[PDB]
Design a protein around this ligand. Structure first.
Ligand code: ADP
Lengths: 96, 616
């Protein structure tokens, strides 16, 4: 359903140490040694809410990197039978 | 009025820097000066400045000088706004940072009080535990959804909350938030924790560190394990951790005597701790090149070096060379594919006590920069390695200096290997074998490089020879660390009436204020710039006279094969490998490139006596 791209080559080549706030949010290449890393975790990808009183399914939404919010108002209501994510029909993506 | 008086101080200062800053006439440096500074900063457009204090103190008779020093935190805004004014005037993305230097006075950290609070000041000390650079707001665009964001202002002083007024609208409030990370201005910063200079502390009060925060392009200027000099921007940080201090502690309980009864109490303790801040950071603490040339020209300056090294010490001539040849190291590079050669050098001085083996040490920690001195047995452990420091807080993995590693590409001096037992010696071996220091403790795994030379002083089993015993059996440190130290330069002192008389004479001389006129051919100050010059060479021997070296290696082991009851050793190939770094060392010494077979012979004989002293 999606193809996201890796780009290739953009020096710079900020080694590691030298970076300032001027560099943030802007694309930056970096080099360095991998140290111990955490295991693989799932990430929400398409987020979906079964609600409670207002029945179902309220359908897939896209969130997020990284916010996942706020699911304000929908489906009858929007309250007080408000939203709880479910296991089924929510798709995840690996994260590390 | 206070607005008006403060603003007057503004106009006075602005006039200052616009008025002549320089009295220098004719040849100069003719006027102005600071305009030239604004413009020289306009060259690379990095938007920060450096302006001297002394001038400013002198000009107005100081009424302005004192007006700045005492109330300086009060007078920041007027000053940088004034600079902005002049910039607007004479010059065409606005971030400005103003840092004075060269104060008339230095104050010890222990001499810091609260009467100098909020006021610029000067503090010098030994930097410790620098911390990775993190952004900061001070200008942010944060508002609610209702009705609109993009309001950008405030959060000036450390709070960090919040929008000051004109909420929401139309929900007008009060309320709070929401903060954007897409719109705001950030700067810097890195925190460093500075310690009192080792030499100064009052007995037995023991050192006490204070915390100095680095914002500005002053960032990263600080260095771990170094003396530095700061100028004030002093301020305060609040502290929760002071309770059961004891009191009596002041509080915020608000006065509600206005309004009327028909918020609650709202009480917040205020407990502050002093922590210095820094605008300016220095590492303090053509005509000369002619001298350098004059040094390389002469044919004796080697001998001058050797004789001039350690005035305090009397003779021995061996450990002089032993000490200097550590300062000037080999190529320590290549050969790839592959594993890298060594490179650097090592020495361990051994002898009957009273031989003043320690004077060398103290002289090295005295003379050369980037040198750590420990007396371990009390290392205790790390010590020679990093903690690592956790937590910080806010993510931690900040690394302690410390001991061995904070001296890098340099000479670390340890007394008494024989006292530190097993635990740390192994670590040192890990330093002199793998060349890297691998650190993993209950947290983030790590690898930290230390490339160092290690000068040790190790006392014999009985503090004596034992001439008849093999040195192998005498020094009493484990085999693998033993074989990495090349070579030992053992000294024993024996009674000779000429030499005895010379010692008594020389020592009594030392304890006499006169005559202290005993002097080396080189001064202790120049010998450093000389050495640092001699360090910039990449001595490489392509020369095929290197063939000769082989037979020299070859000449060395044969006669030393039989008997085995000689000083062997082996002689190990690692000694062939040692002759290399020795050669390159002497090349560093004599400025000569591609060296000579002769210098090779010098390193050679050196190793030879180092061997014969092991013979008996
Ligand atoms: N050649 C020398 N030069 C300077 N001081 C010396 C010399 N020989 C002996 N001394 C004196 O000896 C003392 C050093 O003793 P030392 O040999 O360092 O003991 P240890 O072996 O336990 O370190 C110093 O106080 C110094 O005054």
């Amino acid at each position: 359903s999606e193809i996201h791209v890796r780009i290739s080559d953009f020096p710079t080549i900020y080694s590691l140490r030298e970076l300032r706030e001027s560099n943030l949010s802007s694309l930056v290449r970096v080099t360095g040694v991998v140290t111990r890393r955490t295991g693989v975790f799932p990430q929400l990808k398409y987020v979906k809410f079964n609600c409670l009183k207002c029945g179902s399914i309220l359908g897939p939404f896209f969130q997020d990197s990284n916010e996942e919010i706020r699911i304000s108002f929908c489906t009858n209501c929007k309250s007080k039978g408000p939203f709880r994510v479910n296991g089924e029909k929510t798709v995840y993506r690996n994260y590390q | 009025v206070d607005d008006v008086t403060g603003e007057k101080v503004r106009e006075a200062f602005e006039q200052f820097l616009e008025d002549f800053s320089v009295q220098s006439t004719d040849t100069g440096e003719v006027e102005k000066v600071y305009r030239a500074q604004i413009e020289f900063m306009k060259i690379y457009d990095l938007n920060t400045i450096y302006i001297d204090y002394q001038h400013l103190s002198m000009r107005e008779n100081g009424a302005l000088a004192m007006a700045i020093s005492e109330q300086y935190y009060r007078f920041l805004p007027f000053l940088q706004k004034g600079l902005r004014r002049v910039v607007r005037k004479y010059a065409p993305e606005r971030v400005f940072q103003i840092s004075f230097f060269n104060l008339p006075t230095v104050h010890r950290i222990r001499d810091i009080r609260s009467e100098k609070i909020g006021s610029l000041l000067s503090i010098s000390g030994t930097v410790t535990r620098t911390s990775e650079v993190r952004p900061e707001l001070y200008k942010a665009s944060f508002t609610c959804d209702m009705c609109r964001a993009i309001v950008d202002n405030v959060e000036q002083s450390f709070k960090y909350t919040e929008p000051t007024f004109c909420p929401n609208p139309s929900c007008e409030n009060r309320a709070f938030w929401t903060l954007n990370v897409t719109r705001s201005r950030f700067l810097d910063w890195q925190k460093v924790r500075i310690q009192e200079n080792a030499n100064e502390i009052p007995t037995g009060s023991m050192p006490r560190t204070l915390d100095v925060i680095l914002r500005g392009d002053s960032v990263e200027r600080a260095k771990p394990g170094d003396r530095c000099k700061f100028t004030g921007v002093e301020i305060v940080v609040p502290d929760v951790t002071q309770l059961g201090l004891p009191g009596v502690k002041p509080s915020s309980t608000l006065d509600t005597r206005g309004i009327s009864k028909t918020r609650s109490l709202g009480v917040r303790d205020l407990t502050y701790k002093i922590s210095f801040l820094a605008c300016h950071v220095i590492s303090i603490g053509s005509d000369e090149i002619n001298e350098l040339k004059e040094m390389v020209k002469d044919e004796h300056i080697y001998d001058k070096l050797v004789r001039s090294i350690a005035p305090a010490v009397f003779g021995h001539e061996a450990v002089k060379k032993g000490i200097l040849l550590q300062m000037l190291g080999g190529v320590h590079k290549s050969t790839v594919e592959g594993i890298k050669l060594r490179g650097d050098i090592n020495i361990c001085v051994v002898g009957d006590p009273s031989t003043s083996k320690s004077q060398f040490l103290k002289y090295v920690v005295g003379f050369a920069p980037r040198s750590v001195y420990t007396s371990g047995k009390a290392s205790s452990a790390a010590g020679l390695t990093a903690a690592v420091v956790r937590d910080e807080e806010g993510g931690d993995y900040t690394i302690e200096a410390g001991a061995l590693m904070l001296a890098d590409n340099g000479i670390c001096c340890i007394d008494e290997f024989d006292k530190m037992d097993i635990s740390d010696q192994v670590a040192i071996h890990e330093a002199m074998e793998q060349q890297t220091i691998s650190i993993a403790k209950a947290g983030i795994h790590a690898t930290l490089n230390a490339r160092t030379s290690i000068l040790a002083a190790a006392n014999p089993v009985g503090g004596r020879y034992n001439r008849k015993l093999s040195l192998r059996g005498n020094l009493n440190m484990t085999a693998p660390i033993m074989s990495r130290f090349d070579l030992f330069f053992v000294i024993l002192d024996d009674c000779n009436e000429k030499i005895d008389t010379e010692l008594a004479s020389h020592i009594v001389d030392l304890h006499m204020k006169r005559d202290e006129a005993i002097e080396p051919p080189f001064s202790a100050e120049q010998l450093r710039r000389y050495i640092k010059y001699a360090r910039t060479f990449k001595p490489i021997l392509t020369k095929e006279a290197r063939s000769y070296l082989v037979e020299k290696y070859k000449e060395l082991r044969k006669d030393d094969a039989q008997g085995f009851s000689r000083s062997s050793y082996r002689i190990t190939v690692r000694q062939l490998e040692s002759m290399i770094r020795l050669s390159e060392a002497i090349a560093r010494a004599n400025c000569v490139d591609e060296i000579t077979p002769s210098f090779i012979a010098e390193a050679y004989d050196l190793l030879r006596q180092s061997i014969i002293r092991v013979d008996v």
